[model samples]
Target: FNKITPNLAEFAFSLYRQLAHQSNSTNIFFSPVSIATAFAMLSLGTKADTHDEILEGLNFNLTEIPEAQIHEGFQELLRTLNQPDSQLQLTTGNGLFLSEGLKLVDKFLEDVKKLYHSEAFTVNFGDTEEAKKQINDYVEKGTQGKIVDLVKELDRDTVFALVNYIFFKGKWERPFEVKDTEEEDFHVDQVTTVKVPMMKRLGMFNIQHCKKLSSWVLLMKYLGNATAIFFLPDEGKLQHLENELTHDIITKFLENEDRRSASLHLPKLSITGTYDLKSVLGQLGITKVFSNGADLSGVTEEAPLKLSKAVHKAVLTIDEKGTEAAGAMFLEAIPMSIPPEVKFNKPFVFLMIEQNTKSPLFMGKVVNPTQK
Candidate 1:
């Protein structure tokens, strides 16, 4: 539990950094609950249908994991993110996870029989009025009513479990005074630069601005060793950004930014944003994991199973004082790398890595990002 919690937190933050560049939302956040569940299912090496049926709370689709490595990788992921405040608590009740657990219909039951000799590890919470009330109450309170129904509609045996939960609230180290925010010209595409409300602020932030193609590249550093990279193309030149989004270019840009810092003239803006990982994976040269033909031989030693889908979701809320965001990813983990000699001139990929271990917590490439 201790190990898994922090891993989830880091994963959430990593996603935060990736989405920060794509969407200029007020508050962005993501949850690791689905990812954790996916990890657990992969470790057990059970049929995807079985795990999908038994698990509850978030969405889960086909994800390819090597049948051989599921146990080790899942355990490692659990250990890597464990923390005191964060935990994985399992209970048999009509809670969010439990309510979702009920949705695992016939396929799950059949798979359970074939996978686990006796399904003793799984719990069944029969649907009942009392169960519905209990589950609904929990969701309402947990989400402060922002989410009145997390399970959509409860109808099956519920399996309530809590792996971990994280909440973060921060203000920009240097804030963008609300008064300074105003409408400005925002370049949308090669032939268009529309007027939009762009926040403006001047502060001593860790930023880097450089010339690239006909545009300006801006990089902003975040807390806990992360970065927000932006490419403000010169009006009427979107192709330049796309052409420069090679792997090598991105690696070099991050490397150079790491070695330097500069003054920043940031806009005073606030945005609230959210995203799921399926599209991001497709963009990152990882499509098989979510395909019917994906081979997940590494997750377990059993016969290869096709990867179904990887869902990464996040929400971020940003203001002047600091930034508060959260996110979660449910990728069909096959495997994953990095290098320099890269320059982020156009639509390039970015990552937030650990300074010491150099491990990427979150990663994504922006083909054409826009803020609403």
Candidate 2:
């Protein structure tokens, strides 16, 4: 279990990066809650009886690590996923099962006993209007409604929700003058272009251009050893860039490179998207855990119990002001740069994350962005 700890974090970071790379006009976010929950359940299958020790073993060195936050969320997700509502017996079997899962999650929270708390609710209803309202109420109360209606419902059950909450207020190494934002033509794709309030700045920053892929990679350093990487691929070549992405490609992109000063043109964009990542994981060759024949021996000694289902939900918002994001994933059946002449008008993918541990804080892909 100790040996696998780093791998687990690595996997989480990678998944967040990939999704960030894939989102559209939207910031991608997800909770480590599901994965952590799965790990906890798997720990039950292990010979080890010390839950605290097992959790401690999985710790990473990132400063703002959401350890307790994730653990509580994971335990809640697990209870809900495993048994529906254990609350009302008169409900339908499926309802009861879901209720059990929800109750278990709620009870888990009660055990944790935190003064500052947030509640998580997930249900596959014919309509999510009410659920969204409840979630909004919680966010409204939690943040004093400064951020109202943070929860969202999707059209797909396979892809439940991605939740994220990030508080980032930074003085851009080279700040963009709010007065300079202009209604400019933004080209999202070959046939799509919209006028948006784009922020422009001229500064000395690090940047790289992918000659082979016709894309630009930029890096932005944050206060807590954190950095954001923005990749803007050439038009008509977005799919090509996606197809060619590999761990090696990412590694090479991060290698030592020359940095230069460039004028930067950036758009103030915010997006929230819902997606089903099961297929995506399979595409990444991570079929074992989702399969009935998975070997999570590192987590537990038990067999026969496979990951039943996995769902994810994420929301991300970024602008000249700052960035806020939240994501939640359910387990089951299943940057930078700037520069001289650096214009982020083209379609791009970006990731905000911890520099040391490489844990993702927020991620997004801008295909066709227009200011609302």
Candidate 3:
């Protein structure tokens, strides 16, 4: 199968470079899965080159596999991604809302069903308050109430749309006891620092000091196949790590089987990112959908539509217990010898990826953990 995960991983890094370039010091967070899925789904509603760019903008190129296989790739990816297990509560979905009375093309509807498994909705943009509730409630119940009030405000302008989200609530395999969490200094840079509740844990994990990237990669896993990789650049080498990082380098880091004992210290973190994909995607050569030359006629009959706002908002919480919204201590057999110590005290990059597909679900750079 032509893997959609590889395309998504490439996009995640490309978009990251743009976002990081914009905000060098500020925090950055976004979900590659949600944005790519939404764009892929929206491709059905577009025509001409608009359709081609949407998929290509997602880093789908060179192979140019047939449309049917592309859908299979996406469907296969989701079939594995949304697979349920008792250990982790995970949900990833796409949402598309339309202005009231806009008739959709049956071809678009059929493709949406085949690929995204989403039900389209028509809402009155004039009555935005109730429309917002309709959109928010769908996400709230679908993600098991972990995502509430997803759409806080709506525009009075025409052409309606909403949000896409991925909510994962899982407990850590080994939780740091409350006693191990202590307030410590987080150096934002050489001259600045702040206090944070750094949670410490000791374990045998797949961590290594990579001389190539001038960084140390540490792997922390959840109860299931999900994992979080933290890349702590040595001293003040954040720039080198940022410039050298690639999908190949990242997947290579996951391939190492070496497991060593170490003391890991990570701050309790809650990071939320809200992005206007219109500009971001446009910068990535996806501008037709937002321009007058747009041909989204396949979406609805008669009315010419150009996409306005494609807002993606994501939230992530990592703590002593687990990622966000669980408990039990999982202990690994310990060695009597001393272990290496790894602290994520300076600016670092983090990636939350699924081991099954190596799909980067979410990625961000945390300059200061104390900042929301």
Candidate 4:
């Protein structure tokens, strides 16, 4: 786990940085684990230079750890996460769709199931409409209907597509009262403002202030054990804070030893984002898999295969009661001073994490809540 832990962290932050840079001011949400898991499954079917590039792009080093151990680590992580927990409703899964009549190697199929618990299914690429429908329907069901029509269209030469998804809905430890939610001004920027329904709550929360990033970090717990960490950069420093974001910085904030009783004001949000990751993955030095010379021979010796396209879709909802899809303060007994009020009326970044392993499930930036 130690060997793969750093790799997953680096990959998550790298992918986030790439997406954040490209997203600009728009709201974005994605599951790092989901995307990485898809590629991890794909890695099983690659060989030589192609295989090396995929692992490198995923922030894994072949020299440091054997390839077999990488898959075992993922399998352990997945099994641990899937254990029955009474409090949180969370699921992460992966699948491969192959063109009808495509023959896959038995070893590759066995590894996919043994490691990722994923099974390959067949879809006729000739009938694009039916193929599209089948893929979309599978995704919708896999994600519990949180995502729909994931595949809008299919490429004529498409022979294979990989799908990964995560659906999470957890209740807060201390749920906010629905009556307290009201319309308020959320500053998209210094000049622009929009009215959004904001949920207000006051409670003891783990909070910290980072001088380097010039941001206040708040840790809000979910009903079970998961947590959502919010990074509210000071006014006019959103971009700088984003630029400074890294896996280490995030871990430091999570490990911050600060607890206070404070009043928190956050918007009732429902946001979704869809991304085509071909260009983004290429930017991360994963060009081989998408090229004509791709060597995915491990998947099928019958025909040469290359990834046509990769797509990712995610949805998150935060409200007064708890997250359907989807914090801080200081405390004193006597009358001394008012607790600090932390309001998220401006742009901020957030990450939802599985507390035990500190694995990030979803990461996003909320510039405008009303846009989606």
Over all chains combined, what TM-score does candidate 2 have?
0.55
Tens digits of lDDT, candidate 1, 28-48: 334444344443443243334
- TM-scores for all candidates: the values are 0.45, 0.55, 0.91, 0.92
| Candidate number of the best TM-score | 4
C-alpha lDDT of candidate 1 relative to the true structure: 0.37
Off by over 4 Å in 1: 1-43, 47-179, 183-197, 203-215, 234-251, 257-312, 323-372
Q: What is the lDDT of candidate 4?
A: 0.79
Which residue runs of candidate 2 sit more than 4 Å off their true CA positions? Answer: 1-134, 143-171, 246-258, 275-313, 321-340
Q: Which regions of candidate 3 fall more than 4 Å away from where they truly are?
A: 143-153, 323-331
Residue 32 CA error for candidate 4 (Å)? 1.2
Candidate 2: 10-residue stretch with minimal lDDT: 88-97
Q: Write the per-residue lDDT of candidate 2 for residues 147-257, one digit (tens) a residue.
A: 555544433222123232333333233345678788777776677777877887665556777877667888766533445678788767665655554434554555554
Q: What alpha-carbon RMSD in Å does predicted model 2 have with respect to the real structure?
A: 12.7
RMSD of each: 12.5, 12.7, 2.6, 3.1
What are the lDDT figures for the candidates, one per model?
0.37, 0.46, 0.79, 0.79
Alpha-carbon lDDT of model 2: 0.46
The Cα error of candidate 2 at residue 16, in Å, is 7.1
